[PDB]
Amino acid sequence: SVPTKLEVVAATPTSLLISWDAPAVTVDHYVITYGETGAYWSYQEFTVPGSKTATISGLKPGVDYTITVYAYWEHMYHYSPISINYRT
Amino acid sequence: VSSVPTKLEVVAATPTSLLISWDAPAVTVDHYVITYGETGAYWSYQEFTVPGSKTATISGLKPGVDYTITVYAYWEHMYHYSPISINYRT
Amino acid sequence: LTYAPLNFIAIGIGATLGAWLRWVLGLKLNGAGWPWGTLTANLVGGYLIGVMVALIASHPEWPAWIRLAAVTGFLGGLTTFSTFSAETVDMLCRGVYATAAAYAGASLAGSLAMTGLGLATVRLLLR
Amino acid sequence: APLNFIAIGIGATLGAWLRWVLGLKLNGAGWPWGTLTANLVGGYLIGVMVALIASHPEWPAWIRLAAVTGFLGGLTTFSTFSAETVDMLCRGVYATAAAYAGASLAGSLAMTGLGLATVRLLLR
Ligand SMILES: [Hg+2]
Numbered sequence: 001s002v003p004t005k006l007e008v009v010a011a012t013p014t015s016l017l018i019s020w021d022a023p024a025v026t027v028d029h030y031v032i033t034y035g036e037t038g039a040y041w042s043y044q045e046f047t048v049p050g051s052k053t054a055t056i057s058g059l060k061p062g063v064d065y066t067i068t069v070y071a072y073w074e075h076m077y078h079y080s081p082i083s084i085n086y087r088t
Numbered sequence: 089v090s091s092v093p094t095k096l097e098v099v100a101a102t103p104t105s106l107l108i109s110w111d112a113p114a115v116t117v118d119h120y121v122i123t124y125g126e127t128g129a130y131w132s133y134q135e136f137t138v139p140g141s142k143t144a145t146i147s148g149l150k151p152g153v154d155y156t157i158t159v160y161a162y163w164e165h166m167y168h169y170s171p172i173s174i175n176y177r178t
Numbered sequence: 179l180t181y182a183p184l185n186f187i188a189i190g191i192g193a194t195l196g197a198w199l200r201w202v203l204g205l206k207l208n209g210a211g212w213p214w215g216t217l218t219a220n221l222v223g224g225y226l227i228g229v230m231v232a233l234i235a236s237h238p239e240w241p242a243w244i245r246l247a248a249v250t251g252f253l254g255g256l257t258t259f260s261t262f263s264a265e266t267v268d269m270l271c272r273g274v275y276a277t278a279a280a281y282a283g284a285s286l287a288g289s290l291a292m293t294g295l296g297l298a299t300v301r302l303l304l305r
Numbered sequence: 306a307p308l309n310f311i312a313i314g315i316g317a318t319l320g321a322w323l324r325w326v327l328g329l330k331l332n333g334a335g336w337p338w339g340t341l342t343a344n345l346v347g348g349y350l351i352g353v354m355v356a357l358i359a360s361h362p363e364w365p366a367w368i369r370l371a372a373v374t375g376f377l378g379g380l381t382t383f384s385t386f387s388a389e390t391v392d393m394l395c396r397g398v399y400a401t402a403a404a405y406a407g408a409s410l411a412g413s414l415a416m417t418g419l420g421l422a423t424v425r426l427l428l429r
């Protein structure tokens with residue numbers, strides 16, 4: 001249970017805006033990981049530092065996506081993630 | 089960049105088998121690796137290891153086939169003196 | 179603190195211990211034909227790092243020197259890609275592509291597996 | 306011998322430090338450059354080192370032990386690499402994982418070849 005809460009604030013059917021509030025603890029960076037819920041080969045990923053909002057683009061419209069936010073405090077160590085299922 | 093197991097001899101009894109022997113006084117050799125396969129066709133190559141002794145025996149060769157035997161003389165793991173090879177048909 | 183003098187020491191100690199163990203293993207177990215001492219070290223290392231990672235996420239509170247000495251030091255010196263690479267190439271150069279592939283697969287799949295079982299071992303023993 | 310335990314420990318410690326430093330300066334969880342850098346640089350130099358130590362088998366033990374078994378053994382890691390790849394797999398990014406694994410494997414092998422080659426080239 002880290003970047004707690006976590007939600008989606010944006011439209012276009014090709015894009016999406018995640019934001020979270022992750023005070024104490026300390027996070028080195030977050031890795032955002034997203035793909036079509038079903039096919040695991042579709043999953044992609046990008047990295048955001050100790051800020052608190054991300055933006056995903058180039059999504060297929062009307063498709064069931066699964067976003068995960070992994071909160072890494074030191075390269076290979078990360079606190080438990082949060083996921084969201086969202087249709088574009 | 090110089091010669092090793094100096095003196096390499098091959099008896100070839102059978103079209104399936106082969107007897108190598110060498111004489112490799114100073115320098116020291118930790119072990120030899122004998123490497124043999126159908127010349128070129130590199131996935132066919134097999135291999136076995138003999139210590140600081142001085143004679144080996146290869147079996148289960150395909151008859152009438154062009155083989156290449158190599159003796160690599162390793163002194164202490166990953167380092168080896170230049171090898172000796174022999175090409176011959178079974 | 180990330181650049182402190184305790185840390186250079188924590189690493190150096192573990193790195194030296196691991197390196198020694200690897201080398202000893204490499205004497206006792208390893209020939210040019212098939213390097214067990216290396217694979218042993220790389221796999222044992224692969225396993226323990228799975229363990230270590232599961233313990234350090236579950237206790238992120240612990241002090242720096244532990245992760246640095248256990249993982250960055252000990253498991254970094256216990257394991258090697260250099261040696262592995264040189265040994266694989268050695269094989270390739272010898273012409274024994276089968277063997278090389280085998281050793282590379284072993285070393286790669288093996289380490290990955292081990293790390294999984296090391297993670298699993300900890301997740302299992304903290305239900 | 307006791308000289309040897311020292312020869313290794315020194316190199317191992319130097320390599321381990323360099324790797325770690327590299328890992329601070331270059332390394333995220335998304336794609337671990339600091340690791341790959343160390344693993345590849347290591348892969349290269351070991352190719353060099355091996356070509357030099359066959360061509361001069363006369364040199365004393367402590368050199369190979371400190372350069373190769375120590376420095377390059379601590380500079381490089383399979384542990385870290387494995388943990389980072391599994392990390393990716395666990396994240397679901399199998400492409401990336403494969404990529405990092407191929408990079409790390411093919412890369413190191415290549416490097417070692419070029420390291421051998423660079424020595425065979427510069428002794429003719
Ligand atoms: Hg060779």
Ligand SMILES: [Hg+2]
Nearest residue numbers: 070392395396
């Ligand atoms: Hg993860």
